[PDB]
Amino acid sequence: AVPPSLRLPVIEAAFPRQLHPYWPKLQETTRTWLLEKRLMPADKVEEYADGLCYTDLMAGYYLGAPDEVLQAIADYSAWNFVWDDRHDRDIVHGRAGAWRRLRGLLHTALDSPGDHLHHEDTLVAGFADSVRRLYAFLPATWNARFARHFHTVIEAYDREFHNRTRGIVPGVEEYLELRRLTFAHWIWTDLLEPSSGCELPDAVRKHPAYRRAALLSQEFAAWYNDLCSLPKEIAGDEVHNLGISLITHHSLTLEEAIGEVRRRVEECITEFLAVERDALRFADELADGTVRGKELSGAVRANVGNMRNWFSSVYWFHHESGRYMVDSWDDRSTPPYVNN
Ligand SMILES: CC[N+](CC)(CC)Cc1ccccc1
Ligand SMILES: [Mg+2]
Ligand SMILES: [Mg+2]
Ligand SMILES: [Mg+2]
């Protein structure tokens, strides 16, 4: 039963949820992986990991992924959550030296993950391990694009650090720019490709319908998050939230900001439904009747299919995950699953 303030009837009806069959194993393996890489304390894993629904999130998004591809993606994704928490704790404690070191450690590991599998900072070693596996699925051109995209994500996270320490709550249009990167829009978009086991030629993946569909899928997810994480983020002195920068710069009140964010989240859905028809038409014309044609077609179709799936996974993840249940924390500014 979703709060009316967060309820989106169109998702509930027109976007039926999906679940990868490897999910049950995925849940236990990724949990073990957080345990053995020491990414979270053992007693925080035992009592919170599964309840975080990190693996559920991805198993409802990357449908059709080879099991090991999914595993790589879920370990990486769960690492990303821990990184968000560490980034957040570096800010709350003003660990700028620590943050900056980590930052540079990450840029380096990204280009050279083998060399960092056993780095003393467990957060890095954990990064290097998932990244190393992600690079084993596709040609080095895909790997280079991922690194080029994730290099931008680290820097976006750096800008966030400069904003929170100062106090700068970005402008709405500025936030819209920053959010496509802090949410890692283009990472999730790249990982569509190993999930369907094909590196899409630029001509294919930059087709305007593929591009807009991909964009729209990611705007929904990110803006839904801001909507749903807004209470926990307010409590933790976040400044990075569409809700937040609407209040601050447009003098909308709480209930006015939430409404404008909701309206923008709904337009994503209906814009997605329009371009989805186009994306699928394209897939259907790729199939020129050659073996390569069938391959591109099937891969684009699957990717658009998973772009659609993201809507439902993200939606339900925000209501099933302990990550956002701030109303249950002894200290609302400090989530229990976080190392403080
Ligand atoms: C994992 C993606 N997420 C979780 C709500 C939306 C589906 C936001 C996110 C992006 C990047 C890092 C951490 C969280
Ligand atoms: Mg966060
Ligand atoms: Mg963040
Ligand atoms: Mg958030």
Swiss-Prot record:
Residues the entry annotates as binding Mg(2+) 2: D84, D88
Keyword Metal-binding: yes
Cofactors that this protein relies on: Mg(2+); Mn(2+); Fe(3+)
Pathway the protein acts in: Sesquiterpene biosynthesis; epi-isozizaene biosynthesis
Motif DDXXD motif: positions: 84-88
GO molecular function: epi-isozizaene synthase activity; metal ion binding; terpene synthase activity
InterPro entries, per database record: Isoprenoid_synthase_dom_sf, IsozizSyn, Terpene_cyclase-like_2
EC numbers, comma separated: 4.2.3.37
Residues annotated to bind Mg(2+) 3: N225, S229, E233
Alphabetical keyword list: Lyase, Magnesium, Metal-binding
Reactions accelerated catalytically: (2E,6E)-farnesyl diphosphate = (+)-epi-isozizaene + diphosphate
Cofactor note: Binds 3 Mg(2+) ions per subunit. Can also use Mn(2+) and Fe(3+) but less efficiently, and other divalent cations such as Zn(2+), Fe(2+), Co(2+), Cu(2+) and Ni(2+) are nearly completely inefficient as cofactors.
Source organism superkingdom: Bacteria
Keyword Glycoprotein recorded: no
Annotated positions binding Mg(2+) 1: D84, D88
Comment, domains: The Asp-Asp-Xaa-Xaa-Asp/Glu (DDXXD/E) motif is important for the catalytic activity, presumably through binding to Mg(2+).
Described function: Catalyzes the cyclization of farnesyl diphosphate (FPP) to the sesquiterpene epi-isozizaene.
Family of this protein: Belongs to the terpene synthase family.
NCBIfam families for this protein: IsozizSyn
Name recorded for this polypeptide: Epi-isozizaene synthase
Lineage: Bacteria, Bacillati, Actinomycetota, Actinomycetes, Kitasatosporales
